């Protein structure tokens, strides 16, 4: 798992129907890092420091084992200060 902070939301109207209704979020490690997109499995707001899992485990963490995901947000760190 890796420690990343979110920046904003991302909306794409035409999507694979398998992705369900779950939201998507834009994350970096730090301002200036290459942005990535994660599946919001809990619910978090910009500026938060979150824990992201990326593997074949992300699919089971976000929905069912057949979800088309490779990065999911699991928790929010109670205090990080990074």
């Amino acid at each position: 798992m890796k420690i990343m902070q979110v920046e904003k939301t991302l909306v794409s109207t035409n999507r694979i129907a398998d992705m369900g209704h779950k939201p998507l979020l834009v994350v970096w490690e730090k301002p200036g890092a290459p942005r990535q997109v994660a599946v919001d499995a809990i619910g978090c707001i910009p500026g938060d420091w979150v824990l992201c899992v990326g593997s074949s485990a992300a699919r089971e963490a976000a929905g069912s084992k057949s979800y088309p995901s490779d990065l999911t947000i699991i928790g929010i760190i109670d205090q990080w200060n990074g």
């Binding site: 809990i42 978090c44 707001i45 938060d48 109670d78």
Partner: protein, 91 residues
Amino acid sequence: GIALGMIETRGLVPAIEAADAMTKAAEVRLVGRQFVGGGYVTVLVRGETGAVNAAVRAGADACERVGDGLVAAHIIARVHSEVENILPKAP
């Protein structure tokens, strides 16, 4: 303390007793009670996440066999400001 906890029951005796249980069990601040209508009473508390978890656990287990029971108990770690502008700041 900017984490939120809610319990919703049917009747007001379980709601008073659940609020009492929360405030005794954890260091959380009671900000609101209201009648949704039709017999629903909702109690909300504010605090740190670790305090709110304990408070909601105690309150949910302290209203199960009083009266008609409880309907829901939910914990929110961090809230949006748009939603914050519909929450009671004091009861």
